Each structure stands twice: as C-alpha cells, then as structure tokens.
Amino acid sequence: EFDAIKIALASPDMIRSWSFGEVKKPETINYRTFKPERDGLFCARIFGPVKDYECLCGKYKRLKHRGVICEKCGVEVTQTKVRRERMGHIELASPTAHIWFLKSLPSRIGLLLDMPLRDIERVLYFESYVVIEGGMTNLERQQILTEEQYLDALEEFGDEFDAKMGAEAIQALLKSMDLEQECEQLREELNETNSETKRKKLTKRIKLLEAFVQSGNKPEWMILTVLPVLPPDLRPLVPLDGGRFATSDLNDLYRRVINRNNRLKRLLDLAAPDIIVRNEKRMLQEAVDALLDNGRRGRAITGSNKRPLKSLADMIKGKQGRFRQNLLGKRVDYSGRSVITVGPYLRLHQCGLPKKMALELFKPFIYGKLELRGLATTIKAAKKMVEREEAVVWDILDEVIREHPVLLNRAPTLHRLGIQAFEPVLIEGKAIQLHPLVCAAYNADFDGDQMAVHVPLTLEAQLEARALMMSTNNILSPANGEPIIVPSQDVVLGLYYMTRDCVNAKGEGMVLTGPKEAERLYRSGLASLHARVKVRITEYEKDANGELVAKTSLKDTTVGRAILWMIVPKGLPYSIVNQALGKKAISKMLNTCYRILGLKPTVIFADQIMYTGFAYAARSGASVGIDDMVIPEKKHEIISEAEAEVAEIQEQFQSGLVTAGERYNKVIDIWAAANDRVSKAMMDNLQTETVINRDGQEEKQVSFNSIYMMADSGARGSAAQIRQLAGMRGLMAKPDGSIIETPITANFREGLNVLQYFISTHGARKGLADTALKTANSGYLTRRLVDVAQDLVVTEDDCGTHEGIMMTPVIEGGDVKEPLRDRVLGRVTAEDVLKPGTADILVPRNTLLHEQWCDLLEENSVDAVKVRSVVSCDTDFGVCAHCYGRDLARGHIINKGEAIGVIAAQSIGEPGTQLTMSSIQVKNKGSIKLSNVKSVVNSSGKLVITSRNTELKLIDEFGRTKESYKVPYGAVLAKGDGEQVAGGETVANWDPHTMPVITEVSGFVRFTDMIDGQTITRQTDELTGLSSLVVLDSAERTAGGKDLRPALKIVDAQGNDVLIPGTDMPAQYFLPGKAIVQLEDGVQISSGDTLARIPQGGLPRVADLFEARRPKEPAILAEISGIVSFGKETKGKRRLVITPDPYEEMIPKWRQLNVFEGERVERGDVISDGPEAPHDILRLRGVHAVTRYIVNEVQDVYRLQGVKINDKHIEVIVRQMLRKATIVNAGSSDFLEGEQVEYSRVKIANRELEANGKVGATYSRDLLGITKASLATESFISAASFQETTRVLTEAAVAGKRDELRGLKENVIVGRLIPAGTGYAYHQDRMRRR
Amino acid sequence: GQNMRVAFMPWNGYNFEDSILVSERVVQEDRFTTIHIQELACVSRDTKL
Amino acid sequence: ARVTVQDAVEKIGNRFDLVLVAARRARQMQVGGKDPLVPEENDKTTVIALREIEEGLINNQILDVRERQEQQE
Amino acid sequence: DIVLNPLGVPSRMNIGQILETHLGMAAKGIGDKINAMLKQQQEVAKLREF
Amino acid sequence: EIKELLKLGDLPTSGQIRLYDGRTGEQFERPVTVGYMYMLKLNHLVDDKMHARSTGSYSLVTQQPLGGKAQFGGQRFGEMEVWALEAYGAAYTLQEMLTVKSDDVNGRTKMYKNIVDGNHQMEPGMPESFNVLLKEIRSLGINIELEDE
DNA sequence: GGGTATTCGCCGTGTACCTCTCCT
RNA sequence: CGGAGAGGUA
DNA sequence: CATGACGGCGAATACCC
Ligand SMILES: [Mg+2]
Ligand SMILES: [Zn+2]
Ligand SMILES: [Zn+2]
C-alpha cells in the first residue's frame, strides 16, 4: 500500500498531531498497585487500555462496548495493541536544540547560521549571548556578547540591540533569517571572489540552504518546542523476582526530561534570579540531548550501574540497533539446531533429521493431516495426540516430509552454499546427519559443529528449496566455476589405494573378460587389488550427432581400476581411471563428467565415487604407526656437518673475518641448506620402496607407506607437514618476526626438548592469534562489499554496447601466472577475434566462450581476446546478461534477475580468512619484441634505450608472448630486436644505483650557464685521486648557486651544436642537482656511457584496494601531455610545468623525478615512482585502466595464497565503486556545475537531451571506496542500515530525501519481495502497472 | 576418562572428518555413562489477588 | 524432478520462472482441486507440478490459456 | 572399542596420540599376562618375577 | 622402551596387528595400529544441544520469536543468511523468513491457520519491527512515513 | 586575505549457539 | 522475559 | 571516574606568508 519512504523534519504542529495526549507526570506506574499513574509515561487515557476492551476503571469489559470512551476514567475501550502505536508529546517550557542537528558533524545549525560550533554551544549551554536583533547599533546579529560584554553593551546602549542566550536565541535566529534572499546573497558572493576555500565554504552552505528550500523544511524546526514520546509498549518494564522492576534504561531519560521541564516551568511562574532560571534551562537542554543521543555531547549520563544509559539514537544504530538486529536479520519460527554427524549412506539430496526435531518442526502440518483424516476433531485433541507421540502421529510425520525439503545452515554463512536444501530422512538419534560431499561447501566437520534447520512453509519456498538451494543444484562453485562437492580424505584415499599398482601383486599377468571378472577375482581373493592385468574394456564416446559409440579393446590396467570402471557413467574415456587417482584426478573426473554428460550423471557418479572410496578405504586397512614416520638415516650426519660448518663460521667471527650481521646471515643460510638436505633425504627414502619382480629381480616402485599414501593421494597432509613429522621442524621465528638462529633439529617422532617446544609455542600462539583477530577484519570487509554491491542485479539480456576489456595472460617475469583460457572462459567477446592470419574470424562477435571455444582459442594460439565487462556495460540500474557472461555456478549465461552483486561480494569475502595478516635474463626460447623504443648509434653497436621507461616481450615463435620485462632509462640491451634467445643469457644489463643524462650524438660537452665553485664542487677521493665533480643540490648549495640552474650542452669539433633531429629547441641537458660528473670538460663522449650518477600484501592490502585508499607516497603522473620544465623552487615544493594551456604542479623536492628537463611525456606518464593511486589512474588513463589495476592487484593478493576467484566479481565491485560523476560543465541539462551526482542519472539526462537535440553535460567519473560508495547511495534506508545512522538520517531529514524501495536491503527491511530471483518478475509487474 | 581399545583405520566413512565410531559394548558397559543433577525451584509468592 | 530439476529448468528456461510456474500449478492442485496431468505416485503437489512441467504438459502459456478458458465459462 | 581415522593424525601433527596408543597397548599387554597368572592361580613367586 | 615393553607382553614392536572385518570376516589388507587410548567425554552432549521450535513465545518490543533453547526460542536468521538467500534468488523463502516466520503477527497467524488447513500459501504484511523503527525515528523528532501507494 | 599542514573528534572494528550470576 | 558481567563451542 | 587501540577521514586550527 506504499511505494516509497518519505523523511523530513518534524514541525511542532506535526508532533502534536502524532500524539494522543500530553505526558505530565514523571512517575511511570503506581507501585502500590500495578496500575499506571495517570498522565505519566504509561498513562492509559493517552496511550490506551492495559487490557483488551476494558477500561482502567473496569466499567466496560466487552466487545459490544468497543468504541466507547469511558467518562469516569477517560480510557477508550479498544484493543490494547494501540498502546504500541499511540505516541505522546511533552510541552517544553523553553525551546530546546535537537542534538542531532547540532553535534553530528557538520553542524546543521552551525552551517546554516555560518556560526562556529563552539559559539552555538556556548550560547546553547548558557555560556554566551547572541545579538539576534542589533538594529542600528554597532552590534551585528551573530555577534557573541560575553556576559560582561552584554551588560556593558546594555549599559552603553541596551534597547536597540536584542542579544539573547540559550536555545531561544537560536530559535529567533533560525526563524528570522530568510532562506531565499540570503541564498541569493551567497550565490552572488560565490561568483564575487576567486579563493577556492571560500568557494568550498559557500557551496557547502548553499547546498544546505537548497536542501531546506526544496524539501519545505523550516530551519527553526531544528530547535524542539514539543518533544515526542515513544509509545509505552515499545519501552516496557521487565519484572524481576516477581515483585520488582529493573531499569528500563529509556524511561529514566524520559523521567529526567519531564522532571526538569516541570521544575523549569514552575521556576518560571514564581520567578527567580535569572542565573538559576538559566541553570534550569541548561539542564533541561542536557536532559533532552541525553534522551535523544546520550553521550554525543559531554559526559554520558550513568544509571544505577556504571553502565552508560542507552538513548533513542542507540535504539536504531550499531550492531545491536534496530536495523541490524531486527530488520536485516531476525529470529524465525519453524527452526531448530543440533550437532551434526556424518551420514555416509545418504544420497547427495538427503539429510538425516532427528524424528523428534521433525515432529516439533512440522507440528502444524501434523495437526492439519490429523484433522484431515478426522483423527482429531479439534486443535486441542491433535495437540494432545502429538504430545503422546502415538504411532499414527509418526505415520503422519512420515507422510508430511516425503518430498518437503529443509534448509541446513552452518555459521558463519560466508557464501550462499552455507545454506542448502536437503530431503529429510527421519533418524532415531538426536544429531543431524550430513552428507560428506557437501561438508567442504559448509566448511564443516564433525568435531563439535552444529547446524540450524529451517522448514520452508509455502509452496513457493518449497520449490525454491528444490530448484535453487538443493545440494544437487549446487555442485559447482559460484566464485570460480570449479566443482565444490569434490571427494576428500577417506574417499580420495580409497580411490587412490584401489587405483595404485604393485610390481608383483597376486594375480599379475591375468587377462580378464571385463570389470566383473576383476571384481570376482578380488572378492574371492584370487587376485590382488593392485595386480597389473589385461582387461577387456568397453568404453563409450559421444560423436558429432551426440550418440554414444562403443569401442571395445584390451587395456593394460589394474584390478582396482577395472573395478572402479563399473561406476563410471558411459561417455568417459577409460584413461580417466587408468592411473593412480588423487584428489586432483578425482576432481578432474567429476568436472569432466559434468561438462560432457550434465548434472544428473554427475550427481549419480559423485554418490558412487563416495561409496566406493569409503568401502575401499575401509578394506585397505590404512593405518598410522610410529614406524611410518621413517626418519632418514643420513639425518644425524647432515646435522653434525651443519654444526661443524656453523662452528667454523663462528670461528670466522671470533677472529674478525666476518661481522655479526653476516655471521647470523650465513648461519641462517647454512641451516636452511641443511634443512633442505634433510627434507630431500627423507622424501627420497619415504617415496620409494623396493619390491621383488616375478623374475626374482629387485625393482623400485612407489612406496605403499601409509603417510606417504595420504600425502600423495592428497587426502590429508602435505610435504611440509611430513617434514615436521619425520625430518626436522626447522627454523623458527621470534614473536617480533626475526628468525631464531638455532633451528629445531628434532621432529615430532623423536620429540622436542623443552627449549625447542617453547620456541615453537611462539609461532603457534602467533598463528592462532592471527586467525582470531583477522576473522573480524574479513567479516567487516565482507559486509562492506555486500552493501556496496547489494543492489546490483542482472536486469537485461543485452544492452548492445561495443565496449569491453582486453584479456591477456598474466605475465610476471619468466613464468605466466594465469593462462588466457582461465581468464576468458565463460566470457562474451566484445569483437570478432580474427585468426592470427587476420583474414577470417575465428569466433563471431558475441560468443559465450565455453570449453570448446576456448579450446579453439588456445589451439590456434590466440594472443588476446576483447570481452564484455559489467564495468563498461551500458545498462542503467543493473547490468545485462551478455556483459556479465556465464553464470559460474550454473555453467550457462547468467539469467535476468540474478543478484550478482551479492554473489561477487560473497565470493571475494569468503577466502578472506585464508589471506595473510639489476639485469634481465630470458629463461626460454623465442623472439624478442620491443615497444615504445627509440634506437640510435652506439659505441659498441648494442642499442641503448632513450625512450621513456619501456618494456620488452619474449614471444615464442607462434606469436603468443611468454615473457615481459621492464626496461629503465639507460639500460643498454645486450642484443638487438627479434634476434631470438636460447634462454638463460642476460638480455639487458644496467646499474640500479646510477642514472645518466646521456646524449646519443657524440661530441664535446660544453658546460653552459655553468659556474665553477658555486654550482659545482670538486672532490678527489683518496682511493682514486681523480678530480670528480658533484653537482650540489640547490637547497644544500651556496646562495649564489641557487640563482643559476646547471646546464650541459653538446658542441662538436665543427663548433656548432648537434641536436635531436626534427625539433627546433637545442639539445640542452640540465642536471637535477644530484649528479656526479666523472669526465672532464671538452671530452669526446661516445653513446652508451654514463654522464652522471643518480642513486635511485594480504587482507589489509585487499581492503585498502577496495577502499581506494591513497598511498602514503603516491606516484606523480603527467596531468596533461606536453614538454616539461621547472619554475619556482624551495618556495614550498619544486614547481614542474607542462605545456604542449600550461600546467603547474608542486612536488616535494625530496623525491626523485624520472623525467628530464626537456623530456616530453604523454598523459599518465610516471613523473615520480611509487605506488599508483587508483584515483589518478581513473582520472588520467580512464575507467578501463583503473579496473584492470584493481583486478590485477586483488588477484595478485589472492593468487599468492592460491585462491581462485573470477575477475568478474572484482569488476562488479569496481562498477559499484564507479557510480558517481562530477559535472565539469552544466550544459543544457538541469545539473548544477561542480556537484557530484549519480552517473546513471547523467546518462539518462544526456540521452534525453540528445534525443531533443540539445547539448549534454560533460562529466568526470569519480572513484569512491566501498564504504564511501555505500554511504553515498540514493537510498537513505540502505545507508542508515549500513553505518553512520545518525549522520545519514540527519542528511535525509534535512534534505527531505525520498527513498524508492528499489534495492534488496530496502525490500528486506520492509519485508517485501526482493527485486531479484523469483521476486524479480513481481517487481517488474509493480513497475509496469505504475 | 576411560581406557579404550582403539584402532586407527577408516571404517566406511563413519570416522570421516573427525567422526568417531563406537562399539555397542562401550554403551553396554556404561563406560561413558554420566550422572547429571539438576535443581528445580518452585516458588510460591504473594500476588495482588 | 524428485532429485534434480534440470529437465524442468530446460523446459521452462529461466529457473526462477520455473519456480513461479511450478508454484502456480502446485497451488492449482493443492487448493484448486485440479487433477494431475501425470500419474500421481504418492508425490507432493510441487513434485507433481515439476513432473508435469518436465514433460511439456504445463508451462506459463498453457496455464494462461487454460485459465482463460475456465474463466470464460 | 573405538575406530579413529588415521587421516586426522598427519596434518594435525599430534603424534603423541600414536605413541600413547602403542604404550597403552604395551600397558594392557602387561596386565593381560598378570591377569592370566591370576586366573591360572600361579605361585606368588612367578607373579613376583614377572 | 615402548618396543621393549611390547616384547615383554608378547606384542608386536610395530604396534600394528592384523584386524578382521566383523561384517564379512575378511582380512584388512594392511596391519592396523591397535592400542589403548585414554578417551574423555566432554560436556558437550547432544541432549543439551538438540532443539527445535515450530511456534512459541515472542518478544515484547519486537514480535520476533524469543532466543535460546531455555526459552524455547527460534533460530536467528542473521544478515549473512539473508545474503545467502539473496544470492540464491529465493525471494519467497526470504520473505517468509522475514514476515510469516517472524514479527508479522497477522501474517504468521494466517500462515498457521492455512498450514492447518493444508494451504501452503502466505499472506505477508508489514513486519512489526519496521513499525517499531518508524516510531523510534518519530520519537527523535523526525517525520518518517510511508507514502500513498 | 589567502593556502596549506597539523590537530582533534567521530566512525568503524565476524557469525551462530550454549552455561552461570546479578540487576529499583 | 530486557540489560550487564564472566566463561565456553564451532 | 579510567589512565593498555588504532587507522581513516573530514572540519577546524594554526602557521606562513
Ligand atoms: Mg569443526
Ligand atoms: Zn473507563
Ligand atoms: Zn552490457
């Protein structure tokens, strides 16, 4: 019955209109009786009867009497629930200033009246006067007359001026001032200046004035005169120990306000000395501002205990506030919880549910069915029957839950698979039985975990459980598209053991008719499970038509592999099981089954795999014993050799050969080498066993050691843990992070000594505390991401945009971190991907690149692919299916109405707790390409780079670049371009501790504009003795040298100047003042030498990247493109100018600048090194560049830990970060110039203007942090429910904001259907009807 | 606690993810049966009536 | 339909649209007194609706047409 | 009496539970001998020796 | 020393013995570590933890169910559970968690009556906690109201 | 009178569940 | 049946 | 009274012209 939520200020008349009566007495209820005192906080005549349809007096006690107001006691005969809907009012003797509109920064009263907050506070809390109406005297309106000044001013002249004190003065000021006239005055003041800070202040004030003008709110309304009173049933009194009440903590503040108001009013009637009147007025102000926001200004009023009082503002803000505790989440009926145990017999869609729990949960359904067959005439009979737990009631329970799913949830719900739907199977126990394969989805185990169960009530909820949340539909991960039901532990161990082969196992050399004969031989004990045999295998393969063609052949395999083949669905190659099967192999098997055959065979195959793995892990008898931790026989020798080596290098320190620092550095290296040797010996001894062949020969084979099998299969453990078990624990770190010199040479089998164990406790405690404290940061980041992306939903099929992001493989040095296949799988191309021949089109323009398409891409060695991205998608209020691409969880293109923003936020947040906290040598064979390069003559013929810092690519023949290396200024490449490289030889060599001012053309350098002894110094080092020159820094250097800047020109034997061809400005090189001239004057210089010396990660990093935090020392870039120069220096910071209109920027001068005095740079060229601020990247290089930067950095952090997250989620977050635009010029639109508005609004307005033929406004995209972007949303309900509820609500009330129930959070809060998923179409109807 | 004869081996998934398989003889011998004593209070007071 | 809904999903297309159509049909059978178009096998109304959908006997268009006919008498 | 998963031993690296197990067996073994000598009503000298 | 004590008891030094499968009598293929471990029963019994509720008492200020097994309370469907439901697209499940399983008094009463009548259909209304929030914001001297339609 | 660097106050800091005592 | 403090489980 | 938290950010303060 509503479409939007309206918020504004409350006028005194409106507050009176809300109330049903006035509260006058400060005593809540009569303690002698249990009736409430009349006219108090729980008065019945105002708020309603305490009982239903009964007077306070008891005269009327029937529904026939409804509607009759009792004359005796004034109480109306009505439902008692009106007590939680009827509000009161408190008449205030004096105007009181609302605390929210005063102290919530920025002060609204302060901004509106242009007064400082301190001044208003002194006046408000009775420390100063305000000249409301000076008249024609020498006193202005907002002049603060101190009490002395006030009396003396009144003495000299005390009629014309009207200086008042207290909130009544602010009332007078706010009421008198005309908004429109003074707004015009400020608007004309804005253009009548040139000071930027004054412009900022004026526009900040004018925004507040416009907010008041458009909303219809009145300034004087910010000063309260009638105080609303919450309904008493919303602030009840909880009984304790039968006869007494605790502190309500909210009625106390109301009591204090009422008391202070009455005493003020009475000390105003009898009249008193003004000082005590003002004291009473001040303490009434304090009572009201504590009732509204206790503690916001001044000390927090304290109750019976030292605990601060919880005020009205505390009702609605924070974790325990109304929004987060009762609206965004709430306790629900039809719910239970219990300890979870493993059900290994369950199918993937089933859960084990206690029958007692189900009987309690499904109780209304039991009642309904019992009445349905007339076994219980009334509700009471059915309730008694259920309480007795009759057999027929258990039959009813069996019938009800036949196909009615239940939702299982385990906290924390990090991603959506933390809630899944299952078919309940009644079990006799009290614990819930969980299917093993979904445990990884829940991050659940059976060491004490508990889960909650919920019962979908309606048909829509049941079908959403079956079709959306059921475990059979959730086999793939929405974060990366990989399967998430992968077997682990016992199943992996069983499959690995059954698929392992032995050299001389019983039954080797047999030839079997098929898998059934292998199973018969194994079960009858005639053949070992690892016997190498020949088996007739019939496999099936899909053809082009899609039918299964059968091929039968003899396979050289094992008995166990043949047995396992029986459960494999038709259509898979036999080779998929013809190997020892580890966790990786089993996951690949499941993924292949899903890709080829679809969901149903995959679910059946997963169940069969789990059953087979459990059965054969049980049959294997795999155990763990002290003998399995086989310690290498060379361990003691290696330890003694390392000890002798460290003793020798300690003897080196004794005689002074090595310093303490290097002593420790080499002791650490020596111990690391010893640890590596011990680890290698242990693994070599552990990974192999010796076996006698059928020919009596001794043969090596893969070991059947239990722990080695556990590690090799991938079921449990890693090489590192095995090294701790059977090698040595190794080097440990101090709590401060420094490595302890002496490592733990013992292992857990030998046992540590007291000192070693105490040393290891440091790291153990550090890791546990790290986890405990980082979980909170991860949760906070997840909540911020969820908010910033909550409203983003796929709302279109195709917006038709031709833009996109260019995907290439991630290359860092020699290795390629990420194949192009991974980055483009499931993406939609933004252009036709021409075959390298460039003649034809390898894939058409708009193709969802699935497995086969990427197969074609990689097979033809496609270098790069342009794909559509949610960031560049044209759709307003959402994205389109094509730009998002494949739905990773489902495997097809994303459907309309899918809440991709929440999915992206959860996908990024979930692995948050897994996060922490001089030359170039090609390594491979390929041609070398160079871009952004300038080549000139060289002394040795080997090219020197003169271009602004460039890169280098290694392309391996077929045209795919396998390597990239950065090339600084002056790096002289050791080869040419395209020469090809064997691999392992240096390509370029340079000194990272110097940088020249090289001039390509040879000649004699002439020291122009140059003074000896003022701008230069001569030094003669004792070791060398040469008269080298230091170009002293200007601030360091003498006063005389400051006026002249150093300069070095090029002249030749001809006498003229040779300069860079094509230009008009002579080749003149200034030295930056940190340069070392080693050569003498008039020395012929060959190109390719030095002319000067110029010396020179985890979860927090991801949070800083998503918050768009500016780095401490950000890289300076070229704002515009042109030739650089300097200007004023020292006068603050060095000025650099750029011109092709000129640019002028200031730079610390204790920083290093890559560019030289006459070096021309393009827009975005790095002027000074350092981490790049993403704001600058967006400003200069565009949306695409900042998106790529954020994606690359976030994926760097996540790939360091081995976490696989698709880039599209990060792109969704970036798109949410890029929702704001600042107007460069108003144009013909209605947007004011210079303000920040929504980018979609600008798009719509410009599209409409271009339809009308007018000119559209120009805008600059604004990058906002996730917190800032969340708080800057158009919906004030969402922002208030997120953070800073006081500030957001003050903004909304002053502006008079209107909130459309358009996002997910808004509809959740009002309990409507969300505009996503199954409710999406509903909202569409709601849109079309309106 | 109690001294239990224990074998380290997988048993058909019933010891998956730290789960424990317990013989019925352990239940029969009351090895881990425990006594729990709860105190319930019934207070008769004065009410207005 | 009793273990996986992929057949019904492919029949309808959008999964959410499948949920809505199945809910409409299941309400027509639970409260409207309509008879299953498929042989009831002790299934719930939701599962019966899903089974009808995966065989092409029930979709949004068919439901709309039948509703129009029924309201016409 | 109880079947425990071997797979929870390696990654946890709580190897003591293995050694205790071995030692526990040894302990029981000693009792299993003494109990036998108690059921066969052996001489106090033999029990003393063992 | 442990192996010496195992010898004294005529037990294998490896601590591993041949076990047989009770179900079939078949030999487990590898020796199994068999010994005695000293096990403890922790004060985390499933009797004290298992809990379920269909309907029950509700809180005074907000008509949402009570919390805690001792109060026969309902499970809290927090923010992250709501996020999971939104990520699934299960709009109706989320709505019934927010309204008819919660402080929607009229909706929950009608839902119970419909379930007793075999009609699994909800008629959601406005959650009561939203009305509480509206009243609380009114009490701060701020006019917040729903609009026409 | 104007710009910039420093200071100060406010905002935020994981979910779910269980037990006890004490509280105008 | 609200708040506070303490402890604990995942 | 509590005096064991700290990072980020915007408004205000002061310093430097
Ligand atoms: Mg656990
Ligand atoms: Zn009356
Ligand atoms: Zn698009």
PDB file of C-alpha atoms in Angstrom, chain A residues 32 34 241 342 344 436 445-447 488-490 614 618 622-623, chain B residues 7-20 45 48:
ATOM      1  CA  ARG A  32       1.270   0.038  45.499  1.00  0.00           C
ATOM      2  CA  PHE A  34       0.173  -2.461  39.289  1.00  0.00           C
ATOM      3  CA  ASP A 241      11.979 -11.731  41.143  1.00  0.00           C
ATOM      4  CA  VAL A 342      28.343 -37.856   9.186  1.00  0.00           C
ATOM      5  CA  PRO A 344      27.942 -41.913   4.718  1.00  0.00           C
ATOM      6  CA  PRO A 436      30.111 -35.911   3.351  1.00  0.00           C
ATOM      7  CA  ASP A 445      33.489 -31.221  10.049  1.00  0.00           C
ATOM      8  CA  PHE A 446      32.350 -33.432  12.919  1.00  0.00           C
ATOM      9  CA  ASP A 447      34.445 -32.285  15.883  1.00  0.00           C
ATOM     10  CA  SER A 488      38.273 -35.624   0.208  1.00  0.00           C
ATOM     11  CA  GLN A 489      40.003 -37.691   2.904  1.00  0.00           C
ATOM     12  CA  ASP A 490      38.647 -41.293   3.081  1.00  0.00           C
ATOM     13  CA  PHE A 614      34.600 -45.278   1.704  1.00  0.00           C
ATOM     14  CA  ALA A 618      37.798 -49.424   4.900  1.00  0.00           C
ATOM     15  CA  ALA A 622      45.158 -47.910   6.096  1.00  0.00           C
ATOM     16  CA  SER A 623      46.602 -47.006   9.485  1.00  0.00           C
TER      17      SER A 623
ATOM     18  CA  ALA B   7      42.156 -48.972  16.043  1.00  0.00           C
ATOM     19  CA  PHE B   8      43.399 -46.360  13.572  1.00  0.00           C
ATOM     20  CA  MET B   9      41.673 -47.228  10.296  1.00  0.00           C
ATOM     21  CA  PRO B  10      38.881 -45.845   8.099  1.00  0.00           C
ATOM     22  CA  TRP B  11      35.543 -47.602   8.587  1.00  0.00           C
ATOM     23  CA  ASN B  12      33.118 -46.946   5.713  1.00  0.00           C
ATOM     24  CA  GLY B  13      33.037 -43.180   6.236  1.00  0.00           C
ATOM     25  CA  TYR B  14      31.838 -43.332   9.861  1.00  0.00           C
ATOM     26  CA  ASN B  15      35.148 -41.759  11.040  1.00  0.00           C
ATOM     27  CA  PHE B  16      35.114 -39.128   8.231  1.00  0.00           C
ATOM     28  CA  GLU B  17      36.084 -35.581   9.290  1.00  0.00           C
ATOM     29  CA  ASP B  18      36.992 -36.425  12.906  1.00  0.00           C
ATOM     30  CA  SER B  19      33.914 -38.619  13.383  1.00  0.00           C
ATOM     31  CA  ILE B  20      34.212 -41.451  15.899  1.00  0.00           C
ATOM     32  CA  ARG B  45       4.732 -15.877  46.384  1.00  0.00           C
ATOM     33  CA  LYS B  48      -2.129  -8.803  44.187  1.00  0.00           C
TER      34      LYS B  48
END
